[PDB]
Design a protein around this motif. Structure first.
Motif, PDB file in Angstrom:
ATOM      1  N   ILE A  11       0.836  -1.208   0.000  1.00 31.45           N
ATOM      2  CA  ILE A  11       0.000   0.000   0.000  1.00 31.45           C
ATOM      3  C   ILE A  11       0.868   1.255   0.000  1.00 31.45           C
ATOM      4  N   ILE A  12       1.912   1.246   0.821  1.00 35.23           N
ATOM      5  CA  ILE A  12       2.822   2.391   0.926  1.00 35.23           C
ATOM      6  C   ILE A  12       3.974   2.205  -0.033  1.00 35.23           C
ATOM      7  N   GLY A  13       5.094   1.649   0.451  1.00 30.39           N
ATOM      8  CA  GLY A  13       6.211   1.360  -0.424  1.00 30.39           C
ATOM      9  C   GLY A  13       5.726   0.437  -1.514  1.00 30.39           C
ATOM     10  N   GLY A  14       4.476   0.030  -1.335  1.00 26.84           N
ATOM     11  CA  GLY A  14       3.783  -0.823  -2.271  1.00 26.84           C
ATOM     12  C   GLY A  14       3.180   0.013  -3.372  1.00 26.84           C
ATOM     13  N   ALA A  15       2.480   1.092  -2.989  1.00 28.50           N
ATOM     14  CA  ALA A  15       1.904   1.990  -3.988  1.00 28.50           C
ATOM     15  C   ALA A  15       2.964   3.008  -4.368  1.00 28.50           C
ATOM     16  N   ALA A  16       4.220   2.594  -4.198  1.00 30.84           N
ATOM     17  CA  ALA A  16       5.364   3.447  -4.488  1.00 30.84           C
ATOM     18  C   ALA A  16       5.518   4.491  -3.387  1.00 30.84           C
ATOM     19  N   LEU A  17       5.467   4.041  -2.128  1.00 28.07           N
ATOM     20  CA  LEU A  17       5.593   4.964  -0.997  1.00 28.07           C
ATOM     21  C   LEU A  17       4.462   5.989  -1.027  1.00 28.07           C
ATOM     22  N   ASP A  18       3.318   5.591  -1.575  1.00 32.64           N
ATOM     23  CA  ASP A  18       2.169   6.490  -1.665  1.00 32.64           C
ATOM     24  C   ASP A  18       2.565   7.795  -2.350  1.00 32.64           C
TER      25      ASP A  18
END
Length: 20
Positions: A11-18
């Protein structure tokens, strides 16, 4: 190993660190 094992979260480093 990708680059550090478990780079992008989901979600975060997942969504590119948001979008930073």
């Amino acid at each position: 190993w990708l680059r550090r094992i478990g780079k992008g979260v989901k979600i975060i480093g997942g969504a590119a660190l948001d979008h930073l």
